């Protein structure tokens, strides 16, 4: 409760820095915002690690 | 008395050969289809009486071919 | 039970309830389109009669 | 702009040296009048109070 | 070997000329337009249409104006149907933001096949999976001829003994 | 004037205003607001063509 | 039914004071229909 | 004679019983007991493909009067005229900026078609003109090709298009066009297009029925769906 | 699928436009379902006990 | 007619590949063609 | 939409309608006699120097008046109020109604040019 | 598309879609595009055939990261998968290996 929206983002990028090979700034962010929305990104994304994962369900 | 049941007025719609609208009817038939109603399974048709039409013993309400077979049936097929 | 001028005036209003089909067909029923008229003759009286035991 | 021109002295001298500095447009006092004067909506006010 | 291998190169990095690009190649010429003597600008102004053919808008216009035209039918406009209901309301939303995206998203494949981009599959008579009996190895087929008049139902087995009859 | 203004009795003057009144009276606050329907302004009740 | 009718109809329009003149009419007072005649 | 319908709703309804009506039913009782135009047209007109509706042509003439609603086809008109032009001569310009004020006041619906048409006519009927189209003919390399080409640029640029890219489109079915050789270029048909903007204010380039036959109207008709000789479906 | 196969390696790039691409087709419940009148008049399922 | 239809489809039915042949022949083609009903009036 | 598109929102005065006659006339869509349509003749005009005049045949009176009243407002002209009238005698012949417009210190005509007259605002 | 009427059903045809799925191949001249359609392709259902297997060998033989271990095992599943290995398959494994 004490820690920032663009804190969180920050965060997220820093976990997923090496998960696309591509532009991160923006697959990464366009992931966050997918999953700030709410999209079944873990049913679309099963090649995902234990801890990318991780990261995005929390 | 008992003709005032039948005396209930029917307001008119608000706006803003025979019997054939142009429009629709000359409209092509290889691309509006050689159909005269929705092509949902006949068992939802009865013959209308009086009329030279066949309407749904449902009021609208159309169910699909999918809504009477099995899921996933092979040509809807029990 | 009414002559052709009244049933043809109460189909052609609203005083029978009766279902048009084709007027050179044998219609809907199965013994008419099978033999007609004297099948379904037969059909009536095999109903009525020809399924009792008869003691 | 309303509120500056129905504002008083102390009022409207705050408001002109607070924005003496703003790039506002140079509205004449007409919009000001036709947007003061337009209804308000009020199925815009339903939706707002049942949200 | 040379001549052969930079004609392939040629030929390879040739970007894909568009069914409408080389119809109206073929059919302008330079002396229709007037600049007769001038092929390079006639050359240029070729390959600007040509690759200008290519992009998005030009498919949805084409498409639109085929459809104005009247030119689809019920297949296509199933097609479109289901076009329409396969993208959700957020991806309607950010594709009507660009002027053309949603358009395209519903015409696709109308103005590939417009374009004539569309493949050219063969399509032959339906084929469809044995409906044999697997304990008796019989087939059932139907025989219906002069409306409700004759009526028949064959039912078919392999015979081993080579002496099979009707 | 007469042909703009076709007489009408007051016993079915009454019925034609006691017509916008109830149909006013079905309409809500809102959609009454919005459509500019009051009291001094004028409504129609019927539009159509046969 | 002519283009300076038009013109001169417009312009002894707006002379009234109480018609909004429209862009055009300014634009085509500043370039002038081309005349038949003269030549 | 006929009884009174009175198919009016005003002369059905009085005070007296608008009293008892009013109360069991008004606004409060109902609200209690009661719960991109092109593209809307189009997709207004292909749901109709759907398992519980029918493709109509109401739906088809609708989606087509929103796209054909514009006048491209006149802004086109007048910048095909204005290609032809020679931008150094000062004639040709007057001519030019003349031509492109009245494509703007059309596209801005200042003016309206009919006496835009009639200044156009009386612009490319003009002796200097037709001198100066005789010339960009008569020459053997000529700038049609970019004065059209750039028509249709800033025809995007200014916003005199439906939309931003439906003006090359355009120009790549003005040049296929061109290649039928109809007119020579420069010299539309006025006859023709005075035609048709006399009629038309705005330039442009088992059956089914609303109505079902009633058993007295009709003696022997069984209906639109109903087949006499069917067949065995699979 | 949750296994890797040898064909994936020759897979398109995984690109931010194509990532994207892949939720279009994703659409909300909300979306998916519309109340009408049929549904507000609905009959009963069971036998109902009382009118 | 209707004897040879009925063979024809089942042999589609038993064989799958013998569709083609049959189909190209029109041997499943059903006619929809029937006898005139009974009138009076004629 | 009764003022057309290229006046929408152009005018600065608030006309008034006067209704000049109304006739019964034969509209014949189909080879027959189609129907009768009420033929009505009216002009609308402001005492600022603008006016017009329409006239039309429809089904019904409202309709008729309503079209009149579209086709003068797209005829709508105007004259330079000045000197209150004209200073020069115009005389036109137009399918032989030949027309004099002279100036004069005082309105002289009768009532029904007077009127037109005064929705123009020629006071002399 | 699925078919949601009797009409349709008549004219799914699952082993048509062989042909479409070949045509589509060979509009398809990128061999990732290519591949992924494949795969859908083989996760649907639809019967493959001889021209599909013809023309993804004879793509697959020409890429820029493509091992001969992968287009065998590329040749072995489509071969399990029910395509009949003909003779132009055949050759194109032979200059390949």
Known sequence: ?58 | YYWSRYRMPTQMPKFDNEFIDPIDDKFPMSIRGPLVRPDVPEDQYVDSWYICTSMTHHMGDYRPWSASAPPNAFRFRP | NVSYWTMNKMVRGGNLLVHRVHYTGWGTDSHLKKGGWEHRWNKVLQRNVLQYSRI | ?51 | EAQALVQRTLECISRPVSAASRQLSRTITAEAVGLDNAPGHYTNFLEWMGRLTETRAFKTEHALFEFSRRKFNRDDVRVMFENYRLMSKATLLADSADSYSHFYTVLKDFARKVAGEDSRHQIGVRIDEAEVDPETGIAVGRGCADGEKYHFTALLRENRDHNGII | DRWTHPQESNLEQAARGSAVLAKRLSMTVSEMHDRQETAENPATLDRFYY | ?39 | ?234 | ?51 | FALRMAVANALVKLIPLTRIPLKKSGLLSVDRRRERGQFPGY | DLIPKEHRGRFLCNFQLNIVAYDMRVVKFSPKDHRQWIYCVLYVGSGKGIAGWGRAVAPSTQEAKKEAIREAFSNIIAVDLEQEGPMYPVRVNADGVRVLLYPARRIVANFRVADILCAFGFQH | ?97
């Open chain 9, 1 to 51: 699928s949750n296994t890797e196969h040898f064909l994936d390696k020759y897979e398109p790039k995984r690109n931010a436009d194509t990532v994207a691409d892949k939720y279009r087709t994703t659409k909300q419940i909300t979306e998916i379902d519309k109340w009408t009148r049929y549904d507000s008049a609905r009959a009963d399922n069971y036998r109902p006990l009382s009118i």
């Open chain 1, 1 to 58: 409760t004490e820690t920032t929206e663009q804190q969180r983002r920050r965060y997220f990028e820093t976990t997923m820095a090496d998960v696309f090979e591509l532009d991160p700034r923006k697959t990464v962010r366009d992931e966050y915002e997918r999953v700030k929305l709410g999209l079944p990104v873990h049913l679309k994304n099963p090649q995902y690690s234990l801890g990318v994962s991780q990261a995005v369900y929390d």
């Open chain 8, 1 to 234: 004679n006929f009884p009174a319908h009175f198919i009016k709703s005003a002369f059905t309804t009085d005070p007296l019983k608008e009293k008892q009506k009013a109360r069991f039913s008004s606004g409060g009782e109902a609200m209690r007991e009661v719960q991109d135009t092109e593209f809307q047209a189009l997709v207004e007109f292909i749901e109709g493909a759907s398992y519980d509706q029918l493709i109509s042509g109401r739906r088809f003439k609708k989606v087509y009067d929103v796209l054909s609603e514009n006048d491209d086809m006149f802004i086109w008109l007048c910048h095909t005229a204005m290609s032809v032009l020679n931008p150094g001569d000062m004639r040709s310009r007057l001519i030019y900026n003349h031509l492109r004020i009245l494509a703007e006041s059309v596209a801005s619906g200042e003016m309206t078609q009919r006496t835009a048409f009639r200044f156009f006519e009386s612009a490319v009927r003009s002796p200097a003109y037709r001198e100066i189209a005789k010339r960009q003919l008569e020459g053997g390399a000529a700038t049609r090709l970019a004065g059209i080409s750039a028509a249709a640029d800033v025809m995007r640029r200014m916003g005199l298009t439906r939309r931003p890219m439906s003006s090359y489109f355009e120009l790549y079915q003005r040049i296929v066009e061109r290649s039928e050789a109809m007119t020579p270029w420069g010299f539309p048909p006025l006859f023709q297009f005075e035609e048709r903007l006399s009629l038309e204010p705005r330039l442009k380039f088992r059956r089914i029925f609303w109505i079902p036959p009633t058993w007295n109207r009709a003696g022997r008709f069984l209906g639109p769906h109903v087949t006499l000789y069917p067949g065995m479906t699979p």
């Open chain 4, 1 to 51: 702009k309303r509120e500056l021109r129905f504002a008083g002295p102390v009022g409207r001298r705050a408001i002109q040296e607070e924005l003496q500095a703003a790039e506002l447009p140079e509205v004449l006092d007409e919009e000001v009048n036709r947007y003061h004067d337009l209804k308000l909506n009020m199925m815009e006010i339903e939706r707002e109070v049942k949200a």
């Open chain 7, 1 to 39: 039914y002519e283009p300076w009718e038009h013109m001169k109809r417009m312009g002894r329009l707006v002379g009234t004071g109480f018609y909004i003149p429209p862009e055009w009419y300014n634009h085509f007072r500043m370039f002038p229909p081309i005349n038949h005649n003269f030549q």
């Open chain 12, 1 to 97: 598309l699925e078919p949601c009427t009797p009409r349709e059903w008549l004219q799914f045809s699952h082993r048509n879609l062989a042909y479409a799925y070949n045509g589509a191949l060979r509009a398809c001249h990128s061999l990732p595009s290519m591949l992924l359609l494949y795969k859908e392709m083989k996760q649907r259902g639809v019967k493959v055939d001889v021209d599909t297997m013809n023309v993804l060998l004879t793509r697959a033989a020409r890429h820029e990261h493509i091992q001969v271990d992968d287009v065998f095992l590329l040749f072995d599943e489509l071969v399990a998968l029910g395509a009949r290995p003909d003779l132009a398959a055949a050759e194109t494994l032979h200059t390949v290996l």
